[PDB]
Design a binder for this molecule. Structure first.
Ligand SMILES: NC(=O)c1ccc[n+]([C@@H]2O[C@H](COP(=O)([O-])OP(=O)(O)OC[C@H]3O[C@@H](n4cnc5c(N)ncnc54)[C@H](O)[C@@H]3O)[C@@H](O)[C@H]2O)c1
Lengths: 317, 113, 309, 116
């Protein structure tokens, strides 16, 4: 909490009382030769990390999501799965792809084997994310089995049983009394010290913060629309769009299966359809005395996270 | 706060029974001759606390709806199968179905008093 | 019966609070088809006297071999038996499903460590003296009989007579940690024989403790035959609460996974509401859950789900 | 991303500086019944303004121990009343947002002046 990083990509000193490392760092990025060789290489790495993650400059002064799952490259994903995975990192997104193409049994087995092989992990981040994804896949398997035993009878008529009873019993045995909330606490303290930003992924309701922030932004935007006021700086609508894209890119590029659950779907559906409503209000806004267009990514988000009835409501409004 | 009975069309067996939760009847209007009063009517119904009958379940291991409050009868109800998973485990199953209309009958829903 | 029901209730109550510690014996490792000690003792006996027990013999034959054939021969014979890997059995999964605070095991294998890695709970494993001082995690997997992590030599493990003789001097920190964990946490013994060296040593140490100053450890017996009543009284008066797997379920002697599975399924499935059938106990349970809330003027209706787990 | 300069009305002193964030002019007609004669063209012109990051002048802070606004086209509110509505949040609080309403003196009868 020494500084505050905002969606636009500008840092503001919020709690740092001592010397400001980011204030000097940004100018240092903008005479660097006086730094040591190791220090220069480390600064190069830091600059690459910061510019790739969108932390550009300080307060005083679009998105591209790289993933086959987001773009629905269902055949490139199959080809990637077929290829022998050289490294565990390449086998993590491979398990994510296996999950994305159904194949939840294969995805669960692959995640379990990744966890098994992640003993010698340099950092253990892959192990933590694999635990999260395996819990998510077990949840998906359980809910799908319940649906197939229920609605899966009215719908499809027949009984499907995609997962063998032996696999279901084994996964229930392994996942018995598995509190996901504790997963981050039951980690080496080095991981907890270093990977504090991944703590939010542990809790079974990790979109509550994002949902609450989107609720606040939606209320602000609707108040602006009702009053008829004019926003000057970075409008709350732009903040909503920026946070939506940040969440989408973080969840898809890191190959997290929680991106396929109803909570995230509803979060994206509300983040959109609030940009759209605000844009429509902006279009039909009377002039006084004193635009938004949908890209490819917006089309993909609306197609994926919107039910047909939700699109119908958006059209009606 | 009435009750909904889902029954097999041919045999007449009650597939299940639950509690009606929502109903949307939205019928509205490229598509000199005689007026035919063409309309595109849709009826959707979301059901609550649906438990499938043990007999029909064991048998499974066209449909009708009878929603009784005053007295409503939906013939040819197609059950939509949209399945979503919540990361929060799960809480009761919610069933949604759309009223279907046969060409010959041309009737989608019936109201009985 | 009431005795076993109360035993299960205590075990589950301790487990839910995070105060449960599991003392895993060699039976859990044998369930994974790991080479039992008697096989290696027979190998040592064959090597010593040409052609092929008891607590004394188990310690003596390896001890005799150590100084008769040399350290290298001992290490090689033990590595040719223990170097093989095995898959963790369902009993390890059941043990870890209880979320035990600590796992103390005399086994020199890594099956329990592998299961802990599987479950996702990081158990800092302590199998050497240096491990105790530097163990970042608060969850200890205490290998009180050494381990082969450093190497496959016989020094790293406690399986010969002199090793047991100087255990207190050789493993002061490890012994102190195990005793502190036993005194503080609830202990359940699984995969151990009633007439076992480690269990008898623990009972001898417990005898030194002041009366009723400690909790009596639980011992899950998975022997093929039902335990004799006299032995049951003898061991329950020595500071043990015995849960007999053979008594609960009748199974053929040759197979053992069924008894372990039965005991662990009783442990996991058991819930405080599982046993309340009397309508005088229903009110007792509800009042036990709701009484502390009487200190609050109003309790949110939706919040009550937390009260009733 | 335009800046609002706060001045003390009496002199040229700078009360503080901020960045204009939201400006609402919801100026329409008032009740008809409650208020043959020559037309007067009654109105209920209101102008609210919000500033995101306002830092109060150090000299003004030291001295403190009618206001004018210049929003930079250039807009000027000769008289502005800052609405001091303070609300606290559980999330430890950090953007100090200042809301002020333009006032209109009876003689001048003008609230805001926008000039190129
Ligand atoms: N007694 C010997 O020294 C000796 C020599 C050769 C073979 N064996 C065999 O081993 C058994 C004795 O085992 P021990 O030295 O561990 O003493 P043990 O039988 O006392 O050890 C018992 C713990 O190990 C468990 N156990 C025994 N057999 C098991 C199996 N197949 N799978 C899982 N757990 C098992 C029991 O769980 C028990 O609680 C004998 O009954 C015999 O079948 C013993």
């Amino acid at each position: 909490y020494d500084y505050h990083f905002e969606v636009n990509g500008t840092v503001v000193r919020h709690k740092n009382k001592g010397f400001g490392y980011m204030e000097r760092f940004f100018e240092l990025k903008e005479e660097r030769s006086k730094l040591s060789k190791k220090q220069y290489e480390r600064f190069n790495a830091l600059f690459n990390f910061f510019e790739k993650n969108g932390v550009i400059c300080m307060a005083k002064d679009s998105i591209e999501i790289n993933s086959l799952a987001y773009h629905g490259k269902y055949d490139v994903m199959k080809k990637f799965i077929e290829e022998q995975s050289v490294s565990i990192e390449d086998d993590y997104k491979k398990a994510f792809f296996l999950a994305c193409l159904g194949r939840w049994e294969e995805s669960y087995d692959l995640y379990s084997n990744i966890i098994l092989n992640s003993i010698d992990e340099s950092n253990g981040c892959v192990y933590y994310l694999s635990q999260i994804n395996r819990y998510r896949i077990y949840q998906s398997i359980t809910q799908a089995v319940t649906q197939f035993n229920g609605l899966g009878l009215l719908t499809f008529g027949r009984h499907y049983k995609p997962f063998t009873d032996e696999f279901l019993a084994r996964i229930e045995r392994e996942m018995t009394n598995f509190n996901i909330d504790d997963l981050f606490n039951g980690m080496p303290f080095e991981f907890q010290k270093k990977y504090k930003i991944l703590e939010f992924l542990s809790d079974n309701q990790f979109l509550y913060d994002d949902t609450v922030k989107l609720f606040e932004l939606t209320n602000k935007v609707r108040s602006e629309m009702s009053e008829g006021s004019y926003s000057f700086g970075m409008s709350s609508d732009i903040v909503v769009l920026l946070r939506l894209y940040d969440n989408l890119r973080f969840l898809y590029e890191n190959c997290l299966w929680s991106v396929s659950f109803h909570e995230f779907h509803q979060y994206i559906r509300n983040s959109m359809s609030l940009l759209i409503e605000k844009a429509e209000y902006e279009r039909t806004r009377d002039i006084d005395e004193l635009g938004f267009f949908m890209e490819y990514y917006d089309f993909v988000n609306i197609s994926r996270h919107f039910k047909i009835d939700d699109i119908k409501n958006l059209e009606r409004s | 706060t009435a009750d909904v009975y889902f029954k097999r069309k041919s045999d007449g067996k009650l597939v299940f029974t639950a509690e009606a939760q929502t109903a949307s009847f939205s019928q509205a209007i490229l598509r000199k001759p005689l007026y035919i009063l063409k309309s595109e009517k849709e009826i959707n119904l979301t059901v609550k606390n649906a438990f499938f009958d043990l007999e029909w379940l064991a048998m499974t291991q066209r449909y009708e709806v009878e929603y009784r409050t005053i007295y409503i009868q939906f013939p040819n109800v197609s059950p939509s199968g949209e399945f979503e998973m919540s990361l929060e485990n799960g809480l009761a199953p919610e069933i949604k179905f759309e009223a279907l209309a046969d060409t010959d009958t041309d009737e989608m829903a019936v109201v009985i008093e | 019966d009431n005795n076993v029901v109360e035993c299960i209730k205590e075990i589950t109550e301790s487990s839910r609070n995070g105060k449960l510690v599991f003392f895993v014996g060699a039976g859990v490792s044998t369930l994974s088809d790991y080479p039992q000690w008697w096989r290696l003792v027979d190998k040592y006996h064959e090597e010593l006297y040409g052609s092929p027990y008891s607590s004394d013999e188990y310690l003596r034959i390896p001890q005799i071999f150590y100084n008769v054939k040399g350290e290298m021969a001992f290490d090689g014979i033990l590595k040719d038996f223990f170097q093989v890997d095995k898959p963790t059995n369902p009993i390890h999964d059941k043990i870890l499903a209880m979320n035990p605070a600590h796992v103390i095991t005399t086994n020199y294998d890594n099956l329990i460590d592998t299961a802990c890695w599987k479950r996702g709970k990081y158990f800092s494993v302590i199998s050497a003296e240096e491990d105790v001082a530097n163990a970042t995690s608060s969850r200890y997997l205490l290998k009180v009989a050494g381990d082969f992590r450093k190497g496959f030599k016989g020094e790293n493990v406690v399986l010969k007579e002199d090793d047991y003789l100087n255990y207190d001097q050789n493993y002061p920190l490890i012994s102190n940690l195990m005793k502190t964990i036993i005194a503080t946490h609830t202990i359940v013994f699984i995969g151990y024989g009633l007439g076992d060296y480690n269990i008898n040593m623990l009972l001898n140490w417990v005898r030194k403790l002041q009366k009723d100053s400690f909790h009596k450890p639980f011992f899950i017996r998975t022997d093929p035959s039902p335990i004799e009543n006299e032995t049951l009284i003898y061991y329950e008066n020595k500071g043990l609460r015995i849960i007999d797997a053979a008594s609960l379920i009748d199974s053929n002697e040759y197979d053992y996974l069924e008894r372990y599975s039965a005991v662990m399924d009783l442990l996991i499935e058991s819930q405080e509401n599982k046993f309340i059938t009397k309508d005088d106990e229903v009110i007792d349970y509800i009042y036990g859950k709701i009484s502390p809330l009487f200190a609050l003027q109003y309790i949110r209706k939706i919040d009550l789900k937390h009260v009733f787990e």
